[PDB]
Design an enzyme around this catalytic site. Structure first.
Site, PDB file in Angstrom:
ATOM      1  N   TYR A 112     -10.920  11.236   3.681  1.00 25.54           N
ATOM      2  CA  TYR A 112     -10.907  11.174   2.231  1.00 25.54           C
ATOM      3  C   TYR A 112     -12.175  11.859   1.690  1.00 25.54           C
ATOM      4  O   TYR A 112     -12.146  12.447   0.609  1.00 25.54           O
ATOM      5  CB  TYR A 112     -10.785   9.748   1.696  1.00 25.54           C
ATOM      6  CG  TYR A 112      -9.472   9.104   2.138  1.00 25.54           C
ATOM      7  CD1 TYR A 112      -8.266   9.436   1.516  1.00 25.54           C
ATOM      8  CD2 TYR A 112      -9.456   8.155   3.158  1.00 25.54           C
ATOM      9  CE1 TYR A 112      -7.077   8.835   1.915  1.00 25.54           C
ATOM     10  CE2 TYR A 112      -8.275   7.562   3.580  1.00 25.54           C
ATOM     11  CZ  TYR A 112      -7.094   7.913   2.949  1.00 25.54           C
ATOM     12  OH  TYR A 112      -5.947   7.304   3.294  1.00 25.54           O
ATOM     13  N   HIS A 150      -8.210  -0.008   4.936  1.00 25.98           N
ATOM     14  CA  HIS A 150      -8.199   0.903   6.060  1.00 25.98           C
ATOM     15  C   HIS A 150      -8.937   0.343   7.280  1.00 25.98           C
ATOM     16  O   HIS A 150      -8.741   0.875   8.364  1.00 25.98           O
ATOM     17  CB  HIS A 150      -8.893   2.187   5.612  1.00 25.98           C
ATOM     18  CG  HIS A 150      -8.187   2.840   4.461  1.00 25.98           C
ATOM     19  ND1 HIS A 150      -8.070   2.225   3.234  1.00 25.98           N
ATOM     20  CD2 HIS A 150      -7.533   4.047   4.352  1.00 25.98           C
ATOM     21  CE1 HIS A 150      -7.354   3.024   2.393  1.00 25.98           C
ATOM     22  NE2 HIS A 150      -7.037   4.154   3.047  1.00 25.98           N
ATOM     23  N   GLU A 192      -4.757  14.917   3.107  1.00 23.63           N
ATOM     24  CA  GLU A 192      -5.069  14.013   2.009  1.00 23.63           C
ATOM     25  C   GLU A 192      -5.247  14.824   0.727  1.00 23.63           C
ATOM     26  O   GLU A 192      -5.159  14.287  -0.361  1.00 23.63           O
ATOM     27  CB  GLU A 192      -6.339  13.204   2.304  1.00 23.63           C
ATOM     28  CG  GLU A 192      -6.228  12.322   3.557  1.00 23.63           C
ATOM     29  CD  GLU A 192      -5.007  11.398   3.497  1.00 23.63           C
ATOM     30  OE1 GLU A 192      -4.318  11.258   4.547  1.00 23.63           O
ATOM     31  OE2 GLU A 192      -4.672  10.909   2.374  1.00 23.63           O
ATOM     32  N   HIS A 206       1.542  14.566   0.636  1.00 21.01           N
ATOM     33  CA  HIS A 206       1.934  14.272   2.012  1.00 21.01           C
ATOM     34  C   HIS A 206       3.369  14.722   2.279  1.00 21.01           C
ATOM     35  O   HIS A 206       3.651  15.438   3.256  1.00 21.01           O
ATOM     36  CB  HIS A 206       1.760  12.794   2.374  1.00 21.01           C
ATOM     37  CG  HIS A 206       0.338  12.380   2.442  1.00 21.01           C
ATOM     38  ND1 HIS A 206      -0.665  13.020   3.154  1.00 21.01           N
ATOM     39  CD2 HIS A 206      -0.218  11.272   1.939  1.00 21.01           C
ATOM     40  CE1 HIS A 206      -1.776  12.332   3.061  1.00 21.01           C
ATOM     41  NE2 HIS A 206      -1.526  11.245   2.311  1.00 21.01           N
ATOM     42  N   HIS A 214       0.834  -1.187   0.000  1.00 27.69           N
ATOM     43  CA  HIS A 214       0.000   0.000   0.000  1.00 27.69           C
ATOM     44  C   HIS A 214       0.879   1.252   0.000  1.00 27.69           C
ATOM     45  O   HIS A 214       1.889   1.346   0.720  1.00 27.69           O
ATOM     46  CB  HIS A 214      -0.968  -0.030   1.180  1.00 27.69           C
ATOM     47  CG  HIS A 214      -2.173   0.771   0.912  1.00 27.69           C
ATOM     48  ND1 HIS A 214      -3.391   0.185   0.682  1.00 27.69           N
ATOM     49  CD2 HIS A 214      -2.376   2.065   0.886  1.00 27.69           C
ATOM     50  CE1 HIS A 214      -4.319   1.109   0.499  1.00 27.69           C
ATOM     51  NE2 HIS A 214      -3.717   2.262   0.642  1.00 27.69           N
TER      52      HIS A 214
HETATM   53  C1  LIG Z   1      -3.175   5.164  -1.327  1.00 30.82           C
HETATM   54  C2  LIG Z   1      -3.684   5.891  -0.105  1.00 30.82           C
HETATM   55  N1  LIG Z   1      -2.706   5.305   0.900  1.00 30.82           N
HETATM   56  C3  LIG Z   1      -2.721   6.070   2.150  1.00 30.82           C
HETATM   57  C4  LIG Z   1      -2.410   7.544   2.038  1.00 30.82           C
HETATM   58  O1  LIG Z   1      -1.452   8.113   1.489  1.00 30.82           O
HETATM   59  O2  LIG Z   1      -3.214   8.247   2.605  1.00 30.82           O
HETATM   60  C5  LIG Z   1      -1.729   5.399   3.102  1.00 30.82           C
HETATM   61  C6  LIG Z   1      -2.410   4.407   3.703  1.00 30.82           C
HETATM   62  C7  LIG Z   1      -3.334   5.212   4.665  1.00 30.82           C
HETATM   63  C8  LIG Z   1      -2.272   6.121   5.316  1.00 30.82           C
HETATM   64  N2  LIG Z   1      -1.398   6.390   4.316  1.00 30.82           N
HETATM   65  C9  LIG Z   1      -0.290   7.315   4.425  1.00 30.82           C
HETATM   66  O3  LIG Z   1       0.439   7.472   3.467  1.00 30.82           O
HETATM   67  C10 LIG Z   1      -0.135   8.129   5.761  1.00 30.82           C
HETATM   68  N3  LIG Z   1       1.241   7.957   6.326  1.00 30.82           N
HETATM   69  C11 LIG Z   1      -0.602   9.498   5.351  1.00 30.82           C
HETATM   70  C12 LIG Z   1      -0.698  10.433   6.562  1.00 30.82           C
HETATM   71  C13 LIG Z   1      -1.421  10.013   7.718  1.00 30.82           C
HETATM   72  C14 LIG Z   1      -1.426  10.863   8.875  1.00 30.82           C
HETATM   73  C15 LIG Z   1      -0.714  12.112   8.818  1.00 30.82           C
HETATM   74  C16 LIG Z   1      -0.035  12.491   7.634  1.00 30.82           C
HETATM   75  C17 LIG Z   1      -0.035  11.646   6.494  1.00 30.82           C
HETATM   76  C18 LIG Z   1      -5.181   5.592   0.145  1.00 30.82           C
HETATM   77  O4  LIG Z   1      -5.537   4.716   0.879  1.00 30.82           O
HETATM   78  N4  LIG Z   1      -6.198   6.393  -0.609  1.00 30.82           N
HETATM   79  C19 LIG Z   1      -5.918   7.447  -1.502  1.00 30.82           C
HETATM   80  C20 LIG Z   1      -7.291   8.067  -1.955  1.00 30.82           C
HETATM   81  C21 LIG Z   1      -8.345   6.976  -1.448  1.00 30.82           C
HETATM   82  C22 LIG Z   1      -7.809   6.143  -0.472  1.00 30.82           C
HETATM   83  C23 LIG Z   1      -8.113   4.673  -0.723  1.00 30.82           C
HETATM   84  O5  LIG Z   1      -7.314   4.014  -1.394  1.00 30.82           O
HETATM   85  O6  LIG Z   1      -9.134   4.007  -0.344  1.00 30.82           O
HETATM   86 ZN   LIG Z   2      -3.025  10.088   1.820  1.00 29.28          ZN
END
Ligand SMILES: C[C@H](N[C@H](C(=O)O)[C@@H]1CCCN1C(=O)[C@@H](N)Cc1ccccc1)C(=O)N1CCC[C@H]1C(=O)O
Ligand SMILES: [Zn+2]
Ligand SMILES: *[C@@H]1O[C@H](CO[C@@H]2O[C@@H](C)[C@@H](O)[C@@H](O)[C@@H]2O)[C@@H](O[C@@H]2O[C@H](CO)[C@@H](O[C@@H]3O[C@H](CO[C@H]4O[C@H](CO)[C@@H](O)[C@H](O)[C@@H]4O[C@@H]4O[C@H](CO)[C@@H](O)[C@H](O)[C@H]4NC(C)=O)[C@@H](O)[C@H](O[C@H]4O[C@H](CO)[C@@H](O)[C@H](O)[C@@H]4O[C@@H]4O[C@H](CO)[C@@H](O)[C@H](O)[C@H]4NC(C)=O)[C@@H]3O)[C@H](O)[C@H]2NC(C)=O)[C@H](O)[C@H]1NC(C)=O
Ligand SMILES: *[C@@H]1O[C@H](CO)[C@@H](O)[C@H](O)[C@H]1NC(C)=O
Ligand SMILES: [Cl-]
Ligand SMILES: [Cl-]
Length: 576
Positions: free
Chosen positions: A482, A472, A372, A348, A314
């Site tokens: 989101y 998630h 996001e 990010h 992911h």
């Molecule tokens: C692929 C996108 N991946 C996420 C993401 O980047 O958010 C990944 C997994 C969820 C968290 N994440 C991160 O990278 C975090 N380290 C971001 C963050 C959290 C807290 C504070 C600052 C930054 C996503 O799921 N998405 C993207 C749009 C829809 C949704 C989905 O796939 O269902």
């Molecule tokens: Zn994100």
């Protein structure tokens, strides 16, 4: 004393940097070299950070914060008093950490197999099935199989997880984990505000839904699509039906205006993962935003490793809490979706860099939705026909091309609105005890129906836990960010297009190289979490509310077109 609260937040800041770095350290090493060696170091780092959280959180709790004069210091200490999971007694904490790990692991190793034939992982294999199969039964096989193997294997973990996550939230002064999660917005009116925004996008969603349903009816047959009913959830080109652009081929408004195979042209031109992120970096720096440091290039993991080392796939962006080291880990596929995700992740990183001089407690986005949204904003410009052409991925004009591009954008942006809305409506009600394990699944499908207008292609039975088939849920990442992202990203785009001097239709705007557009974003990102988010909103947009009016304005030509088209065919909007 004012000075003793001052000294405390200074110590917290110094020690958090070291400890958080080490943990991100260990967690990285795990994520990008899963072994039980890195897995054992991660576990030890878990206790280290929990132990620092507890030490600092206990002390912060002894400050009567009403009496605190300085507002930054009041704000830091108020946050340090939330121990999160470190609030739990030693036993429970051990077991929660292990639940989280076992859920994440279950999801990410689940495979779907044909009987003595191949096993398919979610990415790329099942994702490609969902994206490209046009055979009802083949889609069903992948759709059902994924739920059979990922979702049901999550169920044995979920009750215990809910129990421990709620317990940690109550121990930090919340009523349940949902309440804790919603508090990240510091917006007492959050639930109603989100509802109003969702209601604003129903005309566009309902019209999109009806047009898509008629197009599915045409392809899959009258016996398999009810023109007044929900759409079966496996036919939208995506495992969760949460975005629909992989069925653009079935729904194009104007087949007469054909457009290029973005994916084929990227491949055709030998785009690599690196070029994808290099292009993202270039867009950031065109805006006068910050380049990612040389270190990012050295240490990030931009494609599934090839030394046969095993990794979590992911896409994610990583702050290591030293103001210098920021990384992305993504198993990038060379295609359009992933180029957007590259932007998403790079947004990010940009935020990490913009607020890296704040106190660590303030190193977050103005709210989770803002975090996001950053990349997606840039990516809206990236997806323009004008920009895609500049990258050599499209040939170009007409009203037709225009309505085609809006449709493409709609199947990503509009289709996602109900999905991104419903996820935490479900979890909020699980956490507050309204949904129990006896009805997890039935209540998920109630919301899938009510919000998205989808139905399961096969009956669910006791033992199914479809939510656990969405990343998630087992990873315990909040999801409302989101839905927020998707609204406020169009407001950002509208404000930056305005800063950039664009005129005419909003969806033709491309803010590439706009330094005025960068400055608006930078000012807001620099705030981190230092001020209520309405102030960052006001920095970017000149006003302080969330508002669907920008997304509507962007989509308005498509709304008109869908109405005319739907009315011509007599569609009944909705699914009675
Ligand atoms: C692929 C996108 N991946 C996420 C993401 O980047 O958010 C990944 C997994 C969820 C968290 N994440 C991160 O990278 C975090 N380290 C971001 C963050 C959290 C807290 C504070 C600052 C930054 C996503 O799921 N998405 C993207 C749009 C829809 C949704 C989905 O796939 O269902
Ligand atoms: Zn994100
Ligand atoms: C209530 O308290 C808060 C908090 O106080 C702070 O924390 C508490 C706990 C105590 O420790 C305090 O002693 C401490 O002050 C008060 O808010 C602070 O107020 C001051 C100003 O009054 C602000 O100073 C600004 O700081 C920025 C950046 O700060 C970090 O990064 C710098 C560069 O990397 C570095 O130089 C600093 O040392 C600092 O370091 C970081 O510290 C955090 C922890 O706080 C740590 O986590 C980081 O890891 C660490 N970073 C590093 C690298 O190690 C600084 O850039 C600003 O400089 C400008 O501002 C001056 C005022 O205008 C100006 O005279 C200077 O010339 C300079 O000018 C600007 O420069 C830019 C860019 O180059 C230029 O383009 C502009 O034109 C120019 N601006 C002009 C001329 O207008 C500045 O000094 C603190 O940020 C602020 N803290 C926060 C985040 O709130 C608050 O004032 C108190 N309130 C009350 C009621 O009094
Ligand atoms: C992966 O993990 C093992 C055990 O922790 C370690 O010794 C090895 O160096 C790692 N490999 C890479 C390429 O990081
Ligand atoms: Cl589902
Ligand atoms: Cl959130």
């Amino acid at each position: 004393d004012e000075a003793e609260a001052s000294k405390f937040v200074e110590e917290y800041d110094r020690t958090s940097q070291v400890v958080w770095n080490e943990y991100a350290g260990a967690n990285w090493n795990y994520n990008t070299n899963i072994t039980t060696e890195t897995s054992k170091i991660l576990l030890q780092k878990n206790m280290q950070i929990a132990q620092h959280t507890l030490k600092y959180g206990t002390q912060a709790r002894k400050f009567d914060v009403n009496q605190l004069q300085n507002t930054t210091i009041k704000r830091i200490i108020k946050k340090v008093q939330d121990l999160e999971r470190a609030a739990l007694p030693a036993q429970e904490l051990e077991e929660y950490n292990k639940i989280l790990l076992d859920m994440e692991t279950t999801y990410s190793v689940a495979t779907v197999c044909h009987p003595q034939g191949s096993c398919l992982q979610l990415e790329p294999d099942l994702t490609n099935v969902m994206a490209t199969s046009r055979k009802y039964e083949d889609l069903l096989w992948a759709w059902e199989g994924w739920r059979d193997k990922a979702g049901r294997a999550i169920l044995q973990f979920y009750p215990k997880y809910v129990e421990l996550i709620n317990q940690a939230a109550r121990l930090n002064g919340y009523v349940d984990a949902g309440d804790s999660w919603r508090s990240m917005y510091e917006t007492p009116s959050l639930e109603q505000d989100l509802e109003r925004l969702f209601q604003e996008l129903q005309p566009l969603y309902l019209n999109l839904h009806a047009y898509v349903r008629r197009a599915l009816h045409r392809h899959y047959g009258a016996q398999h699509i009810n023109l007044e009913g929900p759409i079966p959830a496996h036919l939208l080109g995506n495992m969760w039906a949460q975005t629909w652009s992989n069925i653009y081929d079935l729904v194009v408004p104007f087949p007469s205006a054909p457009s290029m195979d973005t994916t084929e042209a990227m491949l055709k031109q030998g785009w690599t993962p690196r070029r994808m992120f290099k292009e993202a970096d270039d867009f950031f720096t065109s805006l006068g935003l910050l380049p990612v440091p040389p270190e990012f290039w050295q240490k990030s993991m931009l494609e599934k490793p090839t030394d046969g080392r095993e990794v979590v796939c992911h896409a994610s962006a990583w702050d290591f809490y030293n103001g210098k080291d920021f990384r992305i880990k993504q198993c990038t596929t060379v295609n359009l979706e992933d180029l957007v995700v590259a932007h998403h992740e790079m947004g990010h990183i940009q935020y990490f860099m913009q607020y890296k001089d704040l106190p660590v407690a303030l190193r977050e986005g103005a709210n989770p939705g803002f975090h996001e949204a950053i990349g997606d904003v840039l990516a809206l410009s990236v997806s323009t026909p004008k920009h895609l052409h500049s990258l050599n991925l499209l040939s170009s004009g007409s009203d037709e091309h225009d309505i085609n591009f809006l449709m493409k954008m709609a199947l990503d942006k509009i289709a996602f609105i109900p999905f991104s809305y419903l996820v935490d409506q479900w979890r909020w009600r699980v956490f507050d005890g309204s949904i129990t394990k006896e009805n997890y699944n039935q209540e998920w499908w109630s919301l899938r129906l009510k919000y998205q207008g989808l139905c399961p292609p096969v009956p669910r039975t006791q033992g199914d836990f479809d939510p656990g088939a969405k990343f998630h849920i087992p990873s315990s990442v909040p999801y409302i960010r989101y839905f927020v992202s998707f609204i406020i990203q169009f407001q950002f785009h509208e404000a930056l297009c305005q800063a950039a001097g664009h005129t005419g239709p909003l969806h033709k705007c491309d803010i590439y190289q706009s330094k005025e557009a960068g400055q608006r974003l930078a000012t807001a990102m620099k705030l981190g979490f230092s001020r209520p988010w309405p102030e960052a909103m006001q920095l970017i947009t000149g006003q302080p509310q969330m508002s669907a009016s920008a997304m509507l304005s962007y989509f308005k030509p498509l709304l008109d077109w869908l109405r005319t088209e739907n009315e011509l065919h007599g569609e009944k909007l909705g699914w009675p």
